[PDB]
Design a binder for this molecule. Sequence first.
Ligand SMILES: NC(=O)C1=CN([C@@H]2O[C@H](COP(=O)(O)OP(=O)(O)OC[C@H]3O[C@@H](n4cnc5c(N)ncnc54)[C@H](O)[C@@H]3O)[C@@H](O)[C@H]2O)C=CC1
Ligand SMILES: NC(=O)C1=CN([C@@H]2O[C@H](COP(=O)(O)OP(=O)(O)OC[C@H]3O[C@@H](n4cnc5c(N)ncnc54)[C@H](O)[C@@H]3O)[C@@H](O)[C@H]2O)C=CC1
Ligand SMILES: NC(=O)C1=CN([C@@H]2O[C@H](COP(=O)(O)OP(=O)(O)OC[C@H]3O[C@@H](n4cnc5c(N)ncnc54)[C@H](O)[C@@H]3O)[C@@H](O)[C@H]2O)C=CC1
Ligand SMILES: NC(=O)C1=CN([C@@H]2O[C@H](COP(=O)(O)OP(=O)(O)OC[C@H]3O[C@@H](n4cnc5c(N)ncnc54)[C@H](O)[C@@H]3O)[C@@H](O)[C@H]2O)C=CC1
Lengths: 372, 372, 371, 374
Amino acid sequence: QNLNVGLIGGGFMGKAHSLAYAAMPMFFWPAPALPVRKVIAEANPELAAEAARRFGFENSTSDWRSIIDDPDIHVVDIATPNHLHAEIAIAAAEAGKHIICEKPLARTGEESKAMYDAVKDKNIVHMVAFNYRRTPAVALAKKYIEEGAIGRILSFRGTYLQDWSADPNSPLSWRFQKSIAGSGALGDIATHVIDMARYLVGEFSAVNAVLSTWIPERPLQPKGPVDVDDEVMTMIRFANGAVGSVEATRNAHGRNNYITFEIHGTEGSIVFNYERRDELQVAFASDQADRRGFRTVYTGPAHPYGEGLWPIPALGIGYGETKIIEAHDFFKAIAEGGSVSPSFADGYQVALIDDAIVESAAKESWVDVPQI
Amino acid sequence: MQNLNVGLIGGGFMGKAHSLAYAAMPMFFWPAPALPVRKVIAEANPELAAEAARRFGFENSTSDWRSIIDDPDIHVVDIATPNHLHAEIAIAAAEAGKHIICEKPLARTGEESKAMYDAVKDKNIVHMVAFNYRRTPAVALAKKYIEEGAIGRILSFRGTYLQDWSADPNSPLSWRFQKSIAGSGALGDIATHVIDMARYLVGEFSAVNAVLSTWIPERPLQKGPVDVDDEVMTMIRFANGAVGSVEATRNAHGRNNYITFEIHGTEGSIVFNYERRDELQVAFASDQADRRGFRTVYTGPAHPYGEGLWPIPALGIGYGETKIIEAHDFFKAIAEGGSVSPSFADGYQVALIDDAIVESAAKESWVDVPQI
Amino acid sequence: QNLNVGLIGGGFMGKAHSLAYAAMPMFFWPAPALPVRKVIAEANPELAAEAARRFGFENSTSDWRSIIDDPDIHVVDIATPNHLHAEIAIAAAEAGKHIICEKPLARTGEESKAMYDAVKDKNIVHMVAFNYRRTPAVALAKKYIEEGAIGRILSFRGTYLQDWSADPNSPLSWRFQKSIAGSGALGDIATHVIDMARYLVGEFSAVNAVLSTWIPERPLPKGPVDVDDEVMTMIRFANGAVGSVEATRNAHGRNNYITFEIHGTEGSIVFNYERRDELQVAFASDQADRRGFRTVYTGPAHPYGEGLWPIPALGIGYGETKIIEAHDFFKAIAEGGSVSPSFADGYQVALIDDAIVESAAKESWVDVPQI
Amino acid sequence: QNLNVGLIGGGFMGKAHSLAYAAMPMFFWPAPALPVRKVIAEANPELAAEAARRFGFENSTSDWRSIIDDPDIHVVDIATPNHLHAEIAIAAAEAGKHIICEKPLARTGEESKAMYDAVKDKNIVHMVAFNYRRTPAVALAKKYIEEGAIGRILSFRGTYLQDWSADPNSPLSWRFQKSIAGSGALGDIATHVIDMARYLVGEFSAVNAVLSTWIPERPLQPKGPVDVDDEVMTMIRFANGAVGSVEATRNAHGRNNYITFEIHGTEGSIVFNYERRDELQVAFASDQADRRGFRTVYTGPAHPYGEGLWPIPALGIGYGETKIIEAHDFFKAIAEGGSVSPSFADGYQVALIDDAIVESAAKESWVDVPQISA
Ligand SMILES: NC(=O)C1=CN([C@@H]2O[C@H](COP(=O)(O)OP(=O)(O)OC[C@H]3O[C@@H](n4cnc5c(N)ncnc54)[C@H](O)[C@@H]3O)[C@@H](O)[C@H]2O)C=CC1
Ligand SMILES: NC(=O)C1=CN([C@@H]2O[C@H](COP(=O)(O)OP(=O)(O)OC[C@H]3O[C@@H](n4cnc5c(N)ncnc54)[C@H](O)[C@@H]3O)[C@@H](O)[C@H]2O)C=CC1
Ligand SMILES: NC(=O)C1=CN([C@@H]2O[C@H](COP(=O)(O)OP(=O)(O)OC[C@H]3O[C@@H](n4cnc5c(N)ncnc54)[C@H](O)[C@@H]3O)[C@@H](O)[C@H]2O)C=CC1
Ligand SMILES: NC(=O)C1=CN([C@@H]2O[C@H](COP(=O)(O)OP(=O)(O)OC[C@H]3O[C@@H](n4cnc5c(N)ncnc54)[C@H](O)[C@@H]3O)[C@@H](O)[C@H]2O)C=CC1
């Protein structure tokens, strides 16, 4: 069975998404369904037609509403900047389309809520693209935790450290503009870590945070204001009694895409570093005392999703494989008439955690995270 | 834009990696040198062939590879079969005036490989052997440092390829363990990748001195004998006067896809580990005395091929990106009427090196490597 | 010149300190002064006598006051549990003796204050034994920072993760009893990280903390743990940087994992004591195609390198940190100078700990009093 | 019991040796015996007196013969360059002293044979100072192998890679002079790896090697010739049927004290890197399939020698602890009327391997390695 995709935005995530739709059935065969790259929307006709050629779409448009109104489109895939997520998803939901939307779901908790409300009562699959939790090593961590293999979780530490804008001469873009992005590091990269904490540990009860801006204006490439955070650090109380912290920054020289976590359980520990994403480190307390420590486990056929990936460990997982697994599970949900995680429910919950972090930093005090 | 019809022969492991490369290359390298059309796939029987076409997105399928050779509208023949069919298929393709990419090793013996070289060497066709690991961005970056003189003159090279997927004696007797099909075991299957790297980064081999080992002499079928090497180690004299060694094995517990090198130059060193392929390690002698050592460099836009890959370092290179780069350079050679490296000339030189290694092991002496 | 040492405590730190006194001049020659292991005190005569023979002291005693009252003694070295730090240090200061005291300085801010007040108007050398800041790699980090090589510091992350007590059957030693220890992970190990932060970044302005006890009772029949197993705190530095420190006794796979990561405007530095020979430094100024963390092995080219091993990676262990400590302590004494960290630093750390405890109790930011 | 030590030479090993004697009882208590730093010899009386003060020796001399002839000296510790090991050890053995000698035992197999022949019938403890095998990680690897925990050994790889002389302006010290040193990288650093190979895998059956000199002259401490190898690589056939190789060099930028090995067994693998000596990496085939790989094990109380070292893993092993452990075992053998490994027998076997490597390199052929009993 074919599912006709309408992809809105042909930039960085347009590419990664197009790769996923091209490759997914090659990896996961027989596929839950066959993606058809039907129409791509971009900001003007020339951009759109060029994107269609590059990414292999059958049609282009400069008006995304023409995708919403097309009765032959089954999936709407939102790959635009954060300011258009809600308007597009809400239209798509009203037209009864399945939706994958890039993170953060929207710019604020309130805007995210409207998207969740728009889908929560329809029999459509809705997904927020936190692809990093589908790194096989992160799925392997989940497996170990659910089996009890590290016991009860005490403590979680999570980072997302980057440096692509660590230079003040690096130009202003929508990622530095509150009106567009909603927040800086918090929305752009801390949300990936937060989803990861929710996935592996559980729901957040409360946060206590500090937001920092290090580079308050950038050249327009003549300068404009950066009115978002460059860096966030937050302590966390988890609803199950665990404690933790998350730190994200755009200003860590030497750190490129350093999404990490360290989890301490009563019977073991798990460490992950996405810069070496093929590896998961796991220390089991039950190891004999003279041979006890972290094992470096390379993901392959024996680990979650391994049947759909490469025939030996360390043949190498890249960014693409994570989007491929994401597309697979999205399509599986559609084909099976089920739901997928993370959904717009997960999207909205994160946006509420973001609001709580901002409020916490403003008031310099603990803030309870409202639940869903 | 120029569209080239590909006939792929084999829909196994490399059939998948190759299909991914043909679907993805234009998305990464845009504007593309030419657009691959997945036109026909050949497999061992008609049911296999049709299923592989559905899986890998080929328009047509056949159980007979000759029908690809004889089809005037196929521009590219891509040989992804086991080693016993490389020569017959490439020689047919050459005679039909097709561009050819052939999986490594080029064939089972030096003499088979020579017949393939002789068939293409005086034709105006692009011919390539699929030593894709040299197109890991980290390896291309190593080449850049070297050719720039940034580590000075090369003194010594150490290369490995350590695996463990058949380290269990109950792993069965596939074609890779059968000399009549494979030609050799670890030597032809995995040492050739390291030998190609050594030729690319250091230069031509002058002599070798080797030991071949078989640790598991019989396996279950699907009982039968293993008549190839499980492991090879060889010393090398390079024609430029550097020294080195290469070691490959199927029997190193904990080693998954551990293709590595370490190069010592007069002014620096380079160390590469494919299990962490995003990284190149480089130590420059020119560093100030109190801040000298190996730098871990993560590949991205600033490094070779980076313009066609991901927007920041450590977003993550996998196996697929190496095949995408290989496909890009193959197609660029075709579009531009040039040649590509490594070619059948390279494939044949490596077959001669393997033969010299076998001779060496048998005679327990240094053997000069014949030049093509 | 000889400096006569009176060492109080013959346990773990007794052994490390005795090693430092025995080895320091072999390493740093000519030496600032020659340590004489003159008297070791222990808790009873037989322990003391055995400790003097094991550690090579001229004399033993089962009464630490015999050291204070011995006019031959130049140096009092306090290697007892935390409850005796204050009374011993104060008596030694009143006797005009140079003092090194193990961390934490005392059990609380107030007890620490008494120790500081006893030395602050004197010119004796007083030192608190935060020896991890004298790992050569950490001193290297300080050098890079002071040179401006990573620019201005924005952010600090520090850990001390251990697991020696992660098993609930691990017994109720003095480190788990508030009356003796003062606090748990916070006093015992987080203080090393706080010291490193103060050394590399600067003074703490405010803290916001959470304290956790995971294992509330232990075999002595059992008894209650009334200290923290784990602490995490956010930090505002006086200079405007931000950071955090995390320490725990409950991290399976982590043995002596005292680490930091510093983000400056022109570079980053990472250190991991479990691989203490290494310092990781990333300079923004690296050419754009060869930029990232370089792993620097400490040796002759690096701070303290003239007194250590002749090549990098010959190997620094725990003892070398203590030897360097002793070296600088004795150099201060012999020149009539002061040493860092002093009891001023020890007391400042003790104020930071009190602010951390207070912060955790009140679940709010607390300003750190300055001495 | 007190054992009087006469140390000959107060250079770099003088210091590490003096540390071992001063510290060993603090770590391993009760001690087998108490080392006494009685007399140190150096090459002139001013050096000797200065060394005695630096290293805490009671007495000094400029004539090491006065240590041999001193009836109150129990232990002779030879820490000179390679050219004096033999003359000193042979005189100490004839005088009935216990002996620890620095590696390599002597300059050649023949000279090493003389040393072994002088001790093998005497009732003395004799030791060659291959201290790196007493890194606790390496002792741990021995434990795993002897237990059968990685099965039968198929393959061994060892390196000793350094760069302290990778600048050709680094001066022509004795280490670059064949007449003093006997060989370059081979004798100075490959011998440590060869000892580990013997200890962990077994005896060598044959070798096939290449020796390289990259920098053929250096400034004198005007220039002189370097007439030793900078670099060695050798393939190995082990007597038990395992294969392997060893590589050592003075010319590897970024490598400081990179003594490593990788061992492949039928049921697991072991990897060690001295630049991170606190760690041993071990991969067990028996791990469940979804949690299988190299474990990074930090050495401490649970591991060999752990009762004498630090109370938790990763408090930190440095070079000195290896010398302490070495002195512990040496004194233990003296105190118990026993012997220790590696002895002059082992020293001589290594010198024979070196000779075979040299010969192999010159003939470009496999050379069988004689056993010390031949
Ligand atoms: N899951 C992940 O790992 C990542 C997610 N993201 C998210 O993906 C989304 C897109 O980010 P990037 O692709 O990096 O941004 P980008 O700036 O590379 O591309 C966004 C594209 O949106 C197009 N666009 C703008 N207005 C439009 C309109 N009215 N109609 C059609 N197209 C329009 C632009 O022309 C541009 O090409 C963002 O929400 C971002 O937060 C971004 C990077 C990674
Ligand atoms: N460059 C690299 O990194 C790698 C290269 N290789 C090489 O690729 C080649 C294929 O290896 P794999 O894909 O691993 O083998 P495979 O066994 O996974 O697949 C080979 C396929 O060839 C098909 N085949 C056999 N006879 C055929 C015929 N007459 N016509 C059409 N198809 C036929 C089989 O049905 C099978 O599906 C080999 O030469 C191997 O050495 C393999 C793995 C990796
Ligand atoms: N890296 C570092 O700087 C470390 C510092 N420490 C600190 O060192 C101090 C001692 O710790 P450890 O040596 O590990 O404890 P420990 O329990 O090993 O030894 C303490 C010794 O003090 C002795 N003692 C008790 N009362 C005494 C008295 N009245 N007179 C003489 N001796 C007495 C005990 O008999 C015991 O042998 C503590 O303040 C601790 O916080 C401990 C470990 C490491
Ligand atoms: N086990 C290990 O890890 C190491 C072993 N070694 C070995 O230890 C030995 C000494 O090497 P280093 O200490 O590095 O050399 P060095 O050159 O630092 O010291 C040698 C000392 O021997 C002294 N000496 C020379 N002739 C003498 C005489 N007739 N009487 C008394 N002393 C005399 C010299 O004055 C010099 O101070 C060598 O055999 C070397 O191969 C060296 C370094 C490390």
